[PDB]
């Protein structure tokens, strides 16, 4: 039963490799027995003994000595050693890992309404995954008197089995896992919420731990069965338990992208905004003004703020004072718990500021206020990123007006050094280094001009004067908040792309002086393909 015969259509009872090797051994042994019985000449029995030795060697380990014997299709037969060892052997294929029951998988979508401890499970999957629990619950309340009655009820998918399922999945964690599991945060426990459809909804804040994005990723779900497994899922593997990185102790619930963009947008000030300069009783009046269209989210106002600080014994004492802030900061202040100072929100909140706020909350207050704060932060960031209406257009990539003159001057310097080389004053390698340095300096100048032009805008004062404030350009807002993009990518978007390297590594002396707003020509694109494919191949092969 460990070496079965394969039955296929048409009655072909084909044999496996082990049966073939055993048959060869038995045939040789029987022939040798008969020859030894009949007193054959030694010249024949020696050959038979050698063939028997080779047959036994092939059975035990095919290919170790001499040439491996092959089957019908020129492939060597599998021996006992091949079954024992290797990546396809018993240890690594069936003992160190195995396929399991009560498991499923499907594509993951995003659920922005979920709490940190919740997942979105399709009810078609949950009906299959929790079938014995549903049978037990159906029999327990008299709906089914036998097991076949419950089986038929579940097969027909009656209206009451859905209530039974919602009863049985109430507080029962499930383990979500995404491959590859590089660390222990690749498996986490969640409480299911039954949803319509075929995709799994995943909380955004846990996407960084899984290293997952919503463009085709699939996730597997497993169901703990025993009480010990359920309590281990709740007490050890639950997402609300895993907020610090075991590698270095850093947080792993860092908000990103839309949340960061929304929180950064709401906590900013404009020089002359609607509703500026009025005095408010508190954050609630600020929100009431904002929802009525009477004040701007960036207007600079005075707000009466009450903040609590923990005493020496550990009691929260309240101090109330008038603060110079904005409408959006006062509105955001209604989300913070009571143990934190107001200075933690009275600024433009980038990625680092939000992470600092979460870390301060965790250090001062604890775990439960921190998870509630994280959920509220995500909700508010999503809401105000939606309200902002942030978009991307072609006019956002502003090219500096002085780029052409810089390029022309660099070209003139390169022509001068080339003429000097042709005059015999300088050598070849030093001229190459000089050209490279000239182009590097030109690229640095172009980048500085682009960033200087991009990061500031002109605004009209209350009196009618002109002030310079931080730019509200969408690309600059995305890069400055840390939501997406870096300085190098913005430079490639609006300034020259710079010097490129050959696949061996040598820098091509002439650079790509075009950005992506005004596209490259054929030669520049072909030059960039070298580094593109080098990086892609390294990523694929490491």
């Amino acid at each position: 039963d460990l070496r079965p015969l394969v039955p296929l259509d048409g009655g072909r009872f084909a044999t496996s490799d082990l049966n073939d090797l055993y048959r060869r051994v038995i045939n040789r042994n029987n022939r040798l027995k008969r020859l030894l019985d009949l007193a054959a000449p030694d010249i024949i029995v020696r050959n038979e003994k050698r063939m028997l030795q080779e047959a036994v060697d092939a059975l035990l380990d095919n290919g170790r000595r001499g040439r491996a014997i092959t089957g019908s299709n020129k492939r060597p037969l599998k021996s006992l050693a091949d079954m024992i060892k290797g990546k396809q052997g018993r240890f690594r294929q069936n003992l160190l890992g195995k396929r399991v029951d009560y498991s499923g998988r499907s594509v993951i979508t995003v659920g922005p309404y979920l709490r940190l401890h919740q997942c979105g499970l399709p009810k078609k999957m949950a009906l299959e995954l929790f079938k014995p629990f549903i049978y037990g619950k159906l029999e327990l309340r008299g709906l089914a008197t036998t097991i076949k009655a419950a089986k038929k009820m579940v097969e027909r998918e009656e209206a009451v089995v859905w209530d039974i399922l919602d009863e049985v999945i109430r507080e029962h964690p499930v383990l979500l896992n995404r491959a590859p599991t590089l660390h222990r945060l690749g498996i986490q426990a969640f409480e299911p919420v039954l949803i319509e459809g075929k995709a799994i909804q995943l909380h955004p804040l846990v996407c960084a731990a899984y290293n997952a994005d919503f463009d085709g990723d699939q996730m597997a779900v497993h169901v703990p069965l025993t009480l010990e497994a359920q309590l281990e899922a709740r007490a050890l593997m639950m997402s609300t338990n895993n907020i610090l990185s075991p590698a270095n102790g850093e947080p792993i619930i860092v908000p990103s992208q839309d949340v960061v963009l929304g929180l950064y947008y709401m906590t900013r000030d404009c020089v002359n905004a609607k509703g500026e300069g009025m005095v408010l009783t508190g954050p609630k009046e600020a929100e009431r003004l904002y929802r009525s269209g009477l004040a701007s989210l960036h207007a600079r106002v005075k707000v009466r703020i009450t903040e609590y600080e923990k005493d020496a014994n550990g009691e929260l004492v309240a101090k109330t004072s008038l603060k110079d802030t904005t409408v959006g900061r006062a509105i955001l202040w209604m989300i913070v718990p009571k143990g934190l100072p107001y200075s933690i929100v009275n600024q433009a909140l980038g990625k680092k500021a939000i992470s600092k706020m979460l870390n301060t909350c965790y250090r001062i207050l604890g775990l439960k206020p921190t998870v509630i704060f994280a959920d509220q932060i995500m909700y508010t960031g999503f809401a105000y990123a939606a309200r902002s209406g942030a978009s991307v257009g072609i006019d956002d990539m502003v090219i500096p007006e002085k780029k052409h003159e810089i390029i022309s001057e660099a070209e003139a310097e390169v022509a001068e050094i080339q003429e000097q080389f042709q005059s015999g004053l300088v050598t070849a390698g030093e001229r190459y280094n000089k050209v490279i340095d000239i182009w590097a300096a030109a690229n640095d100048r172009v980048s500085k001009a682009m960033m200087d032009n991009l990061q500031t805008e002109t605004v009209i004062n209350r009196d009618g004067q002109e002030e310079k404030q931080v730019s509200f350009n969408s690309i600059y807002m995305m890069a400055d908040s840390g939501a997406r993009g870096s300085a190098a990518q913005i430079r490639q978007l609006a300034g020259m792309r710079g010097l490129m390297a050959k696949p061996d590594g040598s820098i091509i002396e002439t650079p790509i002086t075009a950005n992506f707003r005004e596209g490259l020509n054929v030669l520049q694109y072909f030059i960039s393909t070298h580094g593109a494919r080098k990086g892609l191949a390294d990523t694929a092969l490491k």
């Binding site: 890992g97 499923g104 078609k124 629990f133 459809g197 497994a229 999503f382 939606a386 991307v392 694929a540």
Partner: protein, 1327 residues
Amino acid sequence: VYSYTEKKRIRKDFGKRPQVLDVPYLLSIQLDSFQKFIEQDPEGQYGLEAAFRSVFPIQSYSGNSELQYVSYRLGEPVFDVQECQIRGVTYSAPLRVKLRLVIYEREAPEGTVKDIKEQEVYMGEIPLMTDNGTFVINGTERVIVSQLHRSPGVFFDSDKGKTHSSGKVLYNARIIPYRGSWLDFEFDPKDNLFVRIDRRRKLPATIILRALNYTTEQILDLFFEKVIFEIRDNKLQMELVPERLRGETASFDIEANGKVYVEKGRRITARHIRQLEKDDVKLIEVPVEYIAGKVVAKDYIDESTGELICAANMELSLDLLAKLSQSGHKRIETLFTNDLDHGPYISETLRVDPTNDRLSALVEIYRMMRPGEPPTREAAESLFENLFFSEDRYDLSAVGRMKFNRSLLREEIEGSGILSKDDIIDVMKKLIDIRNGKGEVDDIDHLGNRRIRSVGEMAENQFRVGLVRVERAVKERLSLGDLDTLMPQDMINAKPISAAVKEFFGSSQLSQFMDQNNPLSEITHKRRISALGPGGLTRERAGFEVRDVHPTHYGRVCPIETPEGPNIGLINSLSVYAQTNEYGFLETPYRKVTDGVVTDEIHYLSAIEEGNYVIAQANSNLDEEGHFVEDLVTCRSKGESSLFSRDQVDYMDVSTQQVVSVGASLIPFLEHDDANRALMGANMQRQAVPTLRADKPLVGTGMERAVAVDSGVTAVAKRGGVVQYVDASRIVIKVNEDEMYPGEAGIDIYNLTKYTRSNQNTCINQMPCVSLGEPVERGDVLADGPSTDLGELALGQNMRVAFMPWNGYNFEDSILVSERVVQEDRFTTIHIQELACVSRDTKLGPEEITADIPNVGEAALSKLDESGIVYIGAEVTGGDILVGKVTPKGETQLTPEEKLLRAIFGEKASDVKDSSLRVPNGVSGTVIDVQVFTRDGVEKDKRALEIEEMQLKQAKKDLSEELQILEAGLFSRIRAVLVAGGVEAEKLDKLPRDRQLEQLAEQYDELKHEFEKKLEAKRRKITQGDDLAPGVLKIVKVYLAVKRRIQPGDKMAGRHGNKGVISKINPIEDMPYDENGTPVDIVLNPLGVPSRMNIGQILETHLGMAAKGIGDKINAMLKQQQEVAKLREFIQRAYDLGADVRQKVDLSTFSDEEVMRLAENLRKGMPIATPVFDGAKEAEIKELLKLGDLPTSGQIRLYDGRTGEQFERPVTVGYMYMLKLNHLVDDKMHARSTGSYSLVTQQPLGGKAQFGGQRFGEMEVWALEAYGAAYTLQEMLTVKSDDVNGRTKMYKNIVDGNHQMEPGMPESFNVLLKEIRSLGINIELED
């Protein structure tokens, strides 16, 4: 000048550079190769002729007879392509070869021809390539992928110090034939030459030379230049060549003509050499120690004694000098071996070499190749001769010989296919020259060193592989003397040839199922180049350098179309204009620049030729006459690009799109995208599924028509004419009188493909695009295939899109879709599945297909007809019966129980089982097609006869059409003659049509007889039985069609590398809307743009908005009846817009009807073409926006559908071209509680089709170990797995409400223990 298809809907082109070379036919690489294989070559360079001439004539060992090849022929196939696909057979032709056996007499000089017998023999079936470049092997289309392999010849390489710890470069050379064995020459850290054969034990490099009949003196003469020492009675007076002393220090005193040029301790400089050359210094005095290191060249023997004083290649000493002085010798020959230029390598190798004759070298070679057996002179000589000098075992092909001669700087191109002494000597000399420092190693990744091998060449190689086995069989069977009775037909057998051809065309590595997602998939598959395959590379042994982009790829291999993963850089795509040499080297076209003006003559250059010229860039400005306007033109010269003068330019690129492939040329604004995202978009574009309705891109590049037409998905008019008949399934064209053949009814009948299944279980369906009575011309499109709209490629849909965040539903590439998109079925697809039921023959009678199944109820048999097969149009779900079948189980023994059962319930119920075909669980659809295949000699059922009548009706209809036209013409001829003879016309008009005249009556009879014969032949072909398999009686195939709608979890994509998954379907009143109340279809996250740097999607969105605005203006002008003048004025304004574009559209030549048809086709947006690297500019886009009364910035104010509040900033709203990819969540979702297990391991199976489980691998175990979840891990390892008793205990406990387990022992551990014990090892558990 516009064709009929293009004049219905003209696409506005923003290109500005005139076209000089048209895009070639995209499938030439396949068709040309296979035509070379099949076509008969009178000289026999390629194809079956070369394979036949490389084996035949075949002669016996005694020489009494031989078999001679004469010619070959390919017969007509029995079935055409469509019939082969319907039945499931191979589209192939029989090969008939005329052989000739001659008989020679004995006791006569040479061979006297006693008799010659010639006959044609059947060599088997050769699969044929269709008109679209595919093969139908078993009812399925297949593609043989071309291979990029290493060219034959000699290549010089080195290791860059990686092999040795001292970092010393060790040069080497390798000779690689097309067929044969490799030959390596390599250096040593001690600078000794070595030779390696077949990658085996290393041997000194003089062994081969000695085996080639060379003596030591000859070897030294070949590899060294002699220096003559003359004993002029005074201390060996020397002749000196001044050039020898370059970079040398004189160890003695050098003087000439009484003057000491170089003193003791002084070296020799260039000025000293010049002085010596000027003075012609010859006589030099040297001491006796100047020979203390000099090596003698030849052998000197004393005249008197007669003994050998010294051997060749040995340094001389003082005693030897005295001996040669006293022996009266006046000439000494020495070797010049200065360590700078002429290094002493051959002398050191000879010192290492033990052998000194010709037979010992052969013995050593024989022992190296075949050790462990006694050496024989004859055997060693035969082995050495057959290694490199036998034309039957070694072949240096024409390309190999050409490359060899080019590497050795020879003149002639033609040559012999085997190596010679001169070739090996020249290879050794070139390797030594490279070692000395005069020469470069070869770049193996250079495209001049790599060859393209196509389907024809591989087929020829496999045919020769079979033919050599046939030759061996013939020689084995020709020893027996029976020449008076045997015949060539019974002498040879076609089985090896047919087997080789079948295994090449069916189970090769480069023979693959065609990818049929869309026409672009097929085009990309047929133009694919692979470095893998038999004779290529391995994706694990490849390395980094072979996967990189090379400069020589420019214009030949696309740099941005390759898979990402293990196969990156190993699977490539052909460029648009790329061709191949007669030697298989990729070449690209260029325009010749003569006297500073770019001409219009096109030269195809390969990588070797390309690097010798200065080639101007495609994006280079010209004038009205063709002069460069920039003083410094950017050019590529030697694999590098730089600025050159106007008069140093030799060639220029023909197009701006000659560097990209077909897939990458369909991406608009590609120059604004990052290369990684461009690669992703090119890969994603060819896995989109066709939808119910096709939608042209509305923003394109101009390559859609070429892809649509060069693919075989459309129906293209073979001849011009008028549409006589048009229908949803057939088109009949009445051919023009000037395109008809004599004595022919001129009509073309096109039968359209309707709802057939592709290789990917999708739908293939053709729809007419012509109307009744309209004119057509040759090459016009008559019907549209899948993903084709009026002859243009249409892979997706045009969607109104806004870039903004929406409440976190587009977080991390998620997509928010409107409910109206689902309501309008814009991304609904049809999927077709095939199920088979096979009725076989058993020992207890045959299996019967019938509806009289006893054990099943009356309802389950409601969908079956009288023959037991489901009806056409039946809606079925999982578990329903499709084909009813019963398996016999009868037996003679009948107990009283069986008698009672038969008496009460009838005899039919007994002695029969139920093996019916049922719908798999989770499968639904509609029965749209049933096919029945019956073995010859078996009675046909009613269903098969109905199918046969259905098939016969169509052929009858076609023949009736042709016969009707012919008889109408004949009766028209009859009536004219009858009236001319003089009759009353009224009597003719009243009487029926039965009615010189005898000749036309005979013609009528002959026509009727010929058409009856045609109908009878078609009926005989239709009613012909099948040849299924041994023991197979009947096969029934059922096709089910289902429609898939868009839903969350489905994968969507654009053409610029932007892909995502649908997260939510949003109701119509929740979507953002503009001032007029128009909602958007899709909301995309702007944060995905800046980091990816795929700026082309924003430009595409703006241009799509402008095009839709123009279409809106046209539609508004159409709704209110406006005179044609206004419409044509506005359309002329739209087409004239642009900045010096190359397209001119004049509507004055258009009639009012044509203008109105164009306007009706333009009322949903005007399509626009932006070629890659030659596209539209932002100023042109803004002008087009101003034409349509749209904001120039491309951003509008939107409102929230849920609150009515205006968003605080303007939003980019426009139109994108979205694609639905073949990654559907319906196929992804899978769950399991329990099921079936393996027999050996007792673990759950794998796969959704098997209802299997998820694998909990080692990394998941590590993750559980890092948590400390010991009970969860133990539960995973035993109870949810191969622990059999705990599996059943846990289920019972769960049903009882007790969540506890009893783990036990896994079964796989017991299997491991048994397997270890079977090896003779005692392993056991203790205590």
